[PDB]
Design a protein around this ligand. Structure first.
Ligand SMILES: CC(C)(COP(=O)(O)OP(=O)(O)OC[C@H]1O[C@@H](n2cnc3c(N)ncnc32)[C@H](O)[C@@H]1OP(=O)(O)O)[C@@H](O)C(=O)NCCC(=O)NCCSC(=O)CC(=O)O
Ligand SMILES: CC(C)(COP(=O)(O)OP(=O)(O)OC[C@H]1O[C@@H](n2cnc3c(N)ncnc32)[C@H](O)[C@@H]1OP(=O)(O)O)[C@@H](O)C(=O)NCCC(=O)NCCSC(=O)CC(=O)O
Lengths: 183, 138
């Protein structure tokens, strides 16, 4: 009971620091079964990872004004408008070359491009220019986490840098010059 | 000669027979010209699936997908992967537009083809991109 409570405190802290941590990762860290971790989360009222993602994205779509959920590519997991945003995208068979399992370049671009749009709190946002690098192959069943950050803003454009990752590996980089209008 | 739409699909069909880097099901648009390692063209009908529904403006990843597939199809190598690309959205493409993309090889190294893409709606230049395409024979 006493070991459990200390572990449960430690799990609350893990989730606070890293909201999108998996049960497997938690199982490793605390040397208990995935079953124990689920039960721990249940006592703590912390939903399973996919539910946490759905819940937070729902809240995020409420904060943006430049693009609608139905047209957004991936799940918007973090947004600080005009500053920083992140999305995740699961790569399914619909997103790859079937023979190699390699993700299509337009898929990674769509995720990054959509994220730069959602990040900017303006009614009109249009991509003007983009420079991108496909650093490592993204594969079937990978989850891509894209991070976008505003690096400059003028009267007519936001300049945004995007870096996208599979686990800890940088797989894609893009610089986006985004046109906006307050009308 | 069959109907206009049929003919285009047949020219596309016969064009996918001279390429080896990508297949019909994975190619965005219709491949209307291919001169391997030199030049290719494709056309793409912009339907409601490809636009922002509120404004009718084509999604940038759609125009990019056309241009990107076209560059792949152009290069007559077993392995072809986009390494880098730099693109410009010059004019809004709209619902019901047909975009004609033209890809031209401008340079070639041991490891990459450098390809320039220009996309048009009728006579208007709407999109431009430079694509650095990795290739391998093996
Ligand atoms: C371009 C790169 C291969 C360059 O990496 P390196 O410098 O290590 O490459 P290299 O010259 O040593 O060549 C090794 C690569 O050749 C290819 N290769 C080698 N032998 C092969 C074989 N028997 N069968 C198939 N492919 C083979 C593999 O990709 C291999 O990568 P390895 O050694 O790693 O196995 C890589 O940086 C990369 O994959 N970047 C990501 C590219 C990408 O995913 N582009 C977007 C999707 S394609 C796209 O955008 C087009 C579209 O969607 O239409
Ligand atoms: C960025 C531009 C508006 C800049 O044009 P100008 O330099 O002529 O613009 P300007 O400063 O005179 O301002 C005119 C514009 O103000 C506002 C209206 O959009 C109006 O467009 P008007 O000139 O019509 O009156 C234009 O080049 C353009 O529309 N480019 C196409 C952008 C685009 O379609 N991006 C891809 C889709 S969006 C995208 O990629 C995001 C996504 O899909 O998620």
């Amino acid at each position: 009971k006493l070991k459990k409570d200390k572990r449960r405190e430690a799990i609350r802290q893990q989730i606070d620091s890293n909201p999108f941590i998996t049960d497997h990762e938690l199982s490793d860290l605390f040397q208990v079964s995935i079953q124990t971790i689920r039960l721990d989360r249940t006592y703590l009222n912390i939903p399973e990872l996919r539910k946490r993602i759905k819940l937070v994205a729902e809240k995020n779509y409420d904060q943006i004004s430049s693009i609608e959920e139905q047209e957004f590519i991936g799940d918007l997991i973090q947004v600080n408008p005009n500053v920083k945003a992140q999305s995740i995208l699961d790569i399914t068979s619909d997103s790859v070359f079937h023979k190699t399992g390699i993700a299509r370049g337009h898929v990674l671009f769509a995720q990054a491009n959509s994220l730069c749009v959602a990040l900017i709190k303006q009614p009109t946002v249009l991509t003007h220019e983009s420079s991108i690098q496909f650093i490592e192959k993204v594969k079937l069943n990978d989850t891509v986490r894209a991070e976008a950050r505003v690096v400059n803003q003028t009267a007519k454009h936001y300049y945004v840098e995007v870096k996208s990752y599979v686990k800890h590996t940088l797989v894609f980089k893009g610089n986006f010059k985004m046109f906006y209008d307050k009308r």
